[PDB]
């Protein structure tokens, strides 16, 4: 199999639809005989009392979670490839080409039913649509 | 190979970006051994004088040509599947979307830099966005 579709990246943040995109991203992984790299997209207030920290920890570890399934759906049907913890610093979109760019991504799969308005719209990369 | 990427569909209308596009789902068909099915879009003034007859038979003479030479570079590539001339009454979009029902497609392949908004906007089936 070509270069083209070597490296496939699919954003993950645990709703069923994503789910579902990973099952349609890593079909197609497997399929073409490609890389698959599901990601996961910590997207994190200045008041007194809040503290962010808590959330950080949380949605890291529901990460962990959600990154730990990829792997093992990936594991069972003898994809290659690692799943990533991304944080924004930047929009969702933006770090999900970000990380398009430094992992060698050639593909970015999405789920949905604005993220992925936006990733068409830049127009940066090849980007699949899989609708719930 | 699964069937869920069994039967790919994609929009060509002789831009350069829609050839991109091609030889993107090119690619994609002969490393999932998939088929393929290139469709040609003749989207068709009532005025005293003008005669549309004239751009019609136009459009479908250019679309033989464009089929034509999908139809070559399946043949090379070994890329099974027959180029479609699709024809609006509808919209673009939804005639793709027609095309996708009757011919079984489960994937739709399309050149990008509204239709593609529009097909995404709708999320009746899975949508692939080459960029030019």
Redesign the interface.
Same mark, same amino acid.
């Given at each position: *199999?070509?270069s083209?579709?070597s490296i496939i990246l699919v954003a993950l943040d645990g709703s069923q639809t994503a789910s579902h995109a990973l099952d /349609?991203a890593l079909? %197609?992984a /497997?399929? !073409? =005989? /490609?890389r698959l790299v599901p990601v996961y997209v910590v997207d994190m207030f200045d008041t007194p009392g809040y503290d962010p920290s808590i959330l950080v920890d949380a949605f890291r570890e529901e990460g962990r979670r959600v990154l730990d399934d990829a792997q093992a759906r990936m594991t069972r049907r003898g994809v290659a490839g690692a799943p990533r913890l991304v944080e924004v610093e930047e929009d969702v979109a933006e770090r999900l080409e970000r990380a398009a760019r430094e992992i060698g991504a050639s593909l970015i799969v999405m789920g949905? =039913?604005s993220v !992925?308005?936006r990733l %068409?719209?830049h127009?940066?990369? *090849?980007? %699949?649509?899989? *609708? !719930?």
């Amino acid at each position: *199999p070509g270069s083209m579709y070597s490296i496939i990246l699919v954003a993950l943040d645990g709703s069923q639809t994503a789910s579902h995109a990973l099952d /349609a991203a890593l079909e %197609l992984a /497997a399929d !073409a =005989h /490609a890389r698959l790299v599901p990601v996961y997209v910590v997207d994190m207030f200045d008041t007194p009392g809040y503290d962010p920290s808590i959330l950080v920890d949380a949605f890291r570890e529901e990460g962990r979670r959600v990154l730990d399934d990829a792997q093992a759906r990936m594991t069972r049907r003898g994809v290659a490839g690692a799943p990533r913890l991304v944080e924004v610093e930047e929009d969702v979109a933006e770090r999900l080409e970000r990380a398009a760019r430094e992992i060698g991504a050639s593909l970015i799969v999405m789920g949905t =039913h604005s993220v !992925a308005e936006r990733l %068409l719209r830049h127009a940066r990369c *090849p980007v %699949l649509m899989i *609708p !719930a």
